[PDB]
Design a protein around this ligand. Structure first.
Ligand SMILES: Cc1cc2nc3c(=O)[nH]c(=O)nc-3n(C[C@H](O)[C@H](O)[C@H](O)COP(=O)(O)OP(=O)(O)OC[C@H]3O[C@@H](n4cnc5c(N)ncnc54)[C@H](O)[C@@H]3O)c2cc1C
Ligand SMILES: Cc1cc2nc3c(=O)[nH]c(=O)nc-3n(C[C@H](O)[C@H](O)[C@H](O)COP(=O)(O)OP(=O)(O)OC[C@H]3O[C@@H](n4cnc5c(N)ncnc54)[C@H](O)[C@@H]3O)c2cc1C
Ligand SMILES: [Ca+2]
Lengths: 473, 473
């Protein structure tokens, strides 16, 4: 059948692109191959099925378990015992994932987006535009004037160590371990590795995280990374950076990771389960790109210009499969912008104001540039910081770890970056993204009324600190 | 000794005004009479000692107690034999109050504010400005060019029923009950009554809240008020509005509250303790306003103009003792503005962007105008809302109660109000205040990238709803 737009993929980029295009009056088809455990439709891509949603769910349940075991007596809460029912914990997450799968199907129905459960591939050009063939769980021959490629990503594998999701786990297996492992190994100390390592440590595993890169969380503000590393060590996450990993061997019983530590001493990490979190790679498997001449760069990303247009007429690409931050909200921003451009509008995507969030305890969130980056560009700046120990709400909450930091241009006072480590950082950062979108100044934050007592007041005080006039520190 | 500024009161308005005046290079004295348990200094006024700080502390601890008893099973956390050590819970709050008292003393030292622990009063006008006499815990005779009256408030009492903080409790007694009462009565269903009722209900009390006003939370958005009443009823708070309260009598460890319900039937509420939370009244006890002819209104508020100036030259008044929202951040806004005006600057205080927050579960937070106010002034608007049930972070969290609402001008799209009921609403509202301070539009909120998954996304979606184009609902 004929459509104005065919969207290949139903992850954050594709499902939103489809909905936005439908709002703009277009007949839209969205093709997605993801399957649930019983082989049925499971929209939402990586984020819903093996990504943001399930990882955030396990982080919350594991945080409650940590609270029950170590932080309730100080509140006058006495217990006779605490035990884990892992099937129920994993079960709640599975239910949330399913709710999200169903919810997206419902959204497609409401918006009259035609959903095809299967794999979509380019067949060629025809009179009506592009011929897209659907195979696998559904067979269909579609035609569309515009095609939006939103095929996403796959977990990067360590060379010679394929994932089996039983003992050698990607993000997929990490979210489905059937029993808390005695000893868990994690390769990669980036956002995903820290989150996954935190989950399982809280549930009872001894966790060791090995990172080949010498610098820990290099993209985070220096002050943030240092404080985070300190908190993670206290929590019991044995993080080792600057290591050289050898040939990993997965035997029936033990997985042995031989490595040379940072000091140059030989080591062997012996674990019951291993999670490998060393990045994401763009996915175009089965898209039949090469056949129609759709250009990919050397890393496998679909090549696009500033407006997400590929080399083929009326073929666009968004999300993890193209350049830029590999984040759900980035994919969604591009999906919306491409639908609007197809409709004849301008669209808006600005990577400079995309926020980054780590959902560990403490939470970490930032938007804009770090001090390191500003120094690298020779951009004169002033930074102000305020600790949660001095915040009334953090004190009342019983969680005073961390700080808020605002960095401004030394001459114009324009806010160039905001960095937060502490309670609810993921939510507090919204205010900073807003300020940056208006190209606001540190003094603007400092002069905006913040409700008392709230964690948000730390952002105001950090801004006051830029001008050496914090009121509560 | 001679000071440029003498501030009478060390609550949010006064301690902040004093600090700000000192930052601006003026010589400042701050006089405050509050005493801790041992009769020593205890800065921070109502908010620190018997207000915001301890109330938020008990709310969090009692919420943890509630979580342990009812919301941990679903996360796979089996906690057996949960019990309460009330003395430890109250003790944690007492330690936090002391941290805040000590913190303000340190801020005064750091900023070179001369602190006088005692009662400050006008003596008369002199050539150097105003003669201020300190008595009680300190004896001193000061001369100030400018005086800032920040004497705060006290608890409103029912005629014939004085507080004793044993059986008939104000906010003071409510934060120090020695044992969980089997049956707790609360007169007043406003912010404090709902918060205090929630604390003690979670800890084991059967709570009944009686309110004379026929409308529940009349100042809030009606949809927010309606959902709130539904949530509180479900939680076990028996809230009755439009009742006529008779003569309350306490005797033999019991308290009888005769009343006529909204349907004209006599009733009798028999409880073990009674909290009366029916408002706050301005306090100027011992200020000696008559000696200098300082004008007070018929309720006892210090009369002031739009810039917080009284009828006496160089005498200003801020916070709860003057007109406007009786809130901590409002007092701070005025203290800062007055110090800035004394220094020769313009100052800025805008009640239209002052946020209101209720720290119940769910939390309630709003800023700006409600639909009912806009209808009344005949200003055409557009409202949009989004439920947390459709938000990925709320789902992951396991708390999907409520929604976010954005109200915009129908012609200019300028945001006129934002109303939120749900998880972390107190923190999410900061984004709305910031938008209003920049005179931003609903479309601005909608275009701003919000991190996924975060509760803040609900604010973005509510803004999309204003233009009838929500994506995830
Ligand atoms: C463990 C983990 C945690 C994460 N947490 C967060 C977080 O907290 N916040 C955040 O912003 N981001 C997070 N991410 C990143 C986020 O998941 C991605 O950035 C986002 O999913 C990218 O969306 P997308 O639509 O571009 O691609 P994807 O989500 O990968 O969706 C691609 C979809 O297309 C389908 N597909 C591919 N090829 C075809 C074809 N030929 N035909 C039909 N269908 C096809 C796939 O089956 C898939 O459903 C996380 C990732 C992981 C792995
Ligand atoms: C239970 C409760 C919970 C609350 N929760 C919140 C909340 O969550 N958020 C919020 O914004 N607001 C809250 N409030 C309101 C908040 O406490 C007040 O709005 C705020 O304290 C007002 O500050 P202020 O400086 O004007 O007065 P106050 O805090 O009352 O301080 C006045 C100070 O002056 C002293 N004083 C008075 N006269 C003299 C004199 N002659 N000489 C010397 N000292 C004197 C008093 O002892 C006191 O220390 C709450 C109030 C209560 C009762
Ligand atoms: Ca109302």
């Amino acid at each position: 059948k004929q459509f104005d737009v065919v969207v290949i993929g139903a992850g954050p980029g594709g499902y939103i692109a489809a909905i936005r295009a439908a709002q703009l009056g277009m007949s839209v088809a969205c093709i997605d191959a993801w399957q649930n455990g019983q082989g049925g439709p499971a929209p939402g891509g990586t984020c819903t099925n093996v990504g943001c949603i399930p990882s955030k769910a396990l982080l919350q349940s594991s945080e409650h378990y940590e609270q029950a075991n170590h932080h309730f007596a100080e509140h006058g809460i006495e217990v006779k015992g605490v035990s884990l029912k892992l099937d129920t914990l994993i079960g709640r997450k599975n239910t949330v994932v399913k709710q999200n799968n169903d919810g997206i199907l419902y959204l497609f129905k409401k918006n009259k987006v035609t959903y095809f459960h299967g794999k979509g591939a380019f067949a060629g050009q025809v009179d009506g535009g592009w011929s897209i063939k659907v195979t696998g769980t559904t067979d269909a021959d579609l035609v569309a004037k515009h095609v939006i490629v939103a095929t996403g990503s796959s977990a990067r594998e360590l060379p010679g160590l394929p994932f089996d999701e039983k003992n050698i786990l990607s993000n997929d297996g990490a979210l489905n371990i059937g029993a808390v492992p005695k000893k868990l190994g994690v390769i990669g100390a980036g956002v995903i590795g820290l989150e996954m390592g935190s989950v399982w440590r809280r549930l009872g595993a001894e966790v060791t995280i090995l990172e080949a890169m010498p610098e820990f969380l290099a993209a985070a503000d220096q002050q943030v990374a240092k404080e985070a590393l300190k908190s993670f060590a206290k929590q019991g996450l044995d993080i080792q950076t600057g290591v050289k990993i050898g040939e990993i061997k997965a035997a029936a019983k033990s997985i042995t990771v031989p490595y040379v530590d940072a000091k140059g001493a030989e080591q062997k990490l012996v674990v019951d389960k291993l999670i490998v979190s060393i990045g994401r790679v763009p996915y175009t498997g089965g898209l039949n790109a090469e056949a129609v001449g759709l250009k990919l760069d050397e890393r496998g990303f679909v090549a696009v210009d500033e407006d997400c247009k590929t080399n083929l007429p009326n073929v666009w690409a968004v999300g993890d499969v193209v350049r830029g931050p590999m984040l759900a909200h980035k994919a969604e921003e591009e999906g919306v912008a491409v639908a609007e451009r197809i409709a004849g509008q301008h669209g808006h995507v600005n990577f400079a104001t995309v926020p980054w969030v780590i959902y560990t305890s403490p939470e970490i969130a930032w938007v804009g540039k770090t001090e390191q980056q500003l120094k690298a560009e020779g951009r004169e700046y002033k930074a102000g910081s305020f600790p949660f120990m001095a915040n009334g709400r953090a004190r009342a909450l019983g969680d005073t770890t961390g700080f808020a930091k605002v960095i401004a241009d030394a001459k114009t006072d324009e806010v160039l970056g905001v960095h937060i480590i502490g309670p609810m950082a993921s939510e507090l950062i919204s205010e900073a993204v807003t300020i940056m979108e208006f190209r606001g100044a540190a003094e603007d934050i400092a002069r905006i009324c913040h409700a008392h007592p709230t964690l948000s007041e730390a952002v105001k005080e950090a801004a006051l600190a830029v001008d050496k006039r914090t009121l509560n520190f």
